[PDB]
Design a binder for this molecule. Structure first.
Ligand SMILES: [Zn+2]
Ligand SMILES: [Zn+2]
Ligand SMILES: [Zn+2]
Lengths: 196, 194, 195
DNA sequence: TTTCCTAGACTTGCCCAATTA
DNA sequence: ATAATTGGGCAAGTCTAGGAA
């Protein structure tokens, strides 16, 4: 079938695992993750921290890349991108390309790719060790379009694929989580878990 | 211009074969002998077998192209719907406007005819391997038949064309195709129909 | 031409017109009525016309189409698109915006405008029927609804299809009525019923 | 001549639940 | 448990006949 980006979990030689903040579902939450759903709920354009767990430090030049792909097989060949309303928004942080759904916050070494071959979008940052006195590395992502954006994701489930790659682009590890960009993350999360 | 769906089992005796898929609900690809219709899912493998009576010369290429089955619509270049085209992906070769792609063939070529704008994918004709009887081409349909803005629910014909390095028609075949979710349930049904 | 003749003349080549076969469905964009010898269709869509012949007209031959009002009282007036529709429909670099009738799918179209009669025509080159075909097909588009106030204004038109030579001398001639509308099928179904 | 309707019955993707191995 | 595959069924969305202003 038409090839699509790989999404299988691979801890790699460095024991790469992804972590998240345990925020709860109170009404004030801006980003909340559900361990039972392996799903992150976040508000549009707000901070979404993502934790990198490693058992041994990766080599130097190590990069961390994120990519969104549709969860359903029937839509996997579709490149996740912002709806037209959104790409057209003046919400540029000056670094990200207007069509990318995923941005990286507060990292001037941030890099964006428009795959020449797959048309696929992604964001990379250099991998940093955990801030001394720290257990893991944190990355602040932002999702720039809502799940309900007709014309975009349109209510379809998206996965965020986090890849650990050497300076040459080789795969060192991969992990993933589903995401839902919506106005009320606490409410939505509670509910979807309410269903189980 | 415009292209024919006129069989030309030619001087080589060109014929197409299809696998025996089964009718589960949502089978990936399935062909209906009675209907002469392929029923597949978007982006899924659509195997099409090439059978000749005699090996064609070298330079021979295979071309695929779609057309609306219906009279009026035959003039409308068949292409991907706006949405899918906009959010298209690719494989380093396939252009975003093409509906039909060829899977696993690093020698594939994609054409948008300058004078018809008509789109097509052509691969070289490869004689079957020693001990084989036919040659398979795997195709993928990039939009469902019901893609509003595209297929808009209208029937298409895939027309395979054997041709020489020159572009001369050496042979011709066709099949209708229905890209849908659930090719299984839909072939049964459209059979039940008779 | 003040008002070109619309008389049928198969002439030396056995020139005939052919038409597709669809019923009165709403979903039927274009539809020909043999009884009414009228063709209904809807704005901007495909109008397939079958060019039958008994004798193969020589290379260079041409097929010109022209609309004329049907009523005598309207005959001398040129059929043109309304001013509205005229300020947009110009897509397909060959078709001038005023022309009501266009042909699609032919690199060689040639639009006319009698400099002395102001009538608008779409010319094409005669072409033999497809290898295993018994007729050549032309794809016509009617650029305005017969409704266009300011355009056809509810007035019936006739399309005269002529076979002519490189010089433009007439060879054969047919014609038929056209009704550009809103969901054509019914109109025929009905047009055929008062009958 | 268009424009509304009123539904009903399909068309058709995709949910969910059972079920495989 | 655990993923993949499947079949049941559904409901958003389509076009219908059809009468009406
Ligand atoms: Zn959006
Ligand atoms: Zn599509
Ligand atoms: Zn008009």
């Amino acid at each position: 079938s038409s090839s699509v980006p790989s999404q299988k979990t691979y801890q790699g030689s460095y024991g790469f695992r992804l972590g998240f903040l345990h925020s709860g579902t109170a009404k004030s939450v801006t980003c909340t993750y559900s361990p039972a759903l392996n799903k992150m709920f976040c508000q549009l354009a707000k901070t979404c921290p993502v934790q990198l767990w490693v058992d041994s430090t990766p080599p130097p030049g190590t990069r961390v890349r994120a990519m969104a792909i549709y969860k359903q097989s029937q839509h996997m060949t579709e490149v996740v991108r912002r709806c037209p309303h959104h790409e057209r928004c003046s919400d540029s942080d000056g670094l990200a390309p207007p069509q990318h759904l995923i941005r990286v916050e507060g990292n001037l070494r941030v890099e964006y790719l428009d795959d020449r071959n797959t048309f696929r979008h992604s964001v990379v940052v250099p991998y940093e060790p955990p801030e001394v006195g720290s257990d893991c590395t944190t990355i602040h992502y932002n999702y720039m379009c809502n799940s309900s954006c007709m014309g975009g994701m349109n209510r379809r489930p998206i996965l965020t694929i986090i890849t650990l790659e050497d300076s040459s682009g080789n795969l060192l590890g991969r992990n993933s989580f589903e995401v839902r960009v919506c106005a009320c993350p606490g409410r939505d999360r509670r509910t979807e878990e309410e269903n189980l």
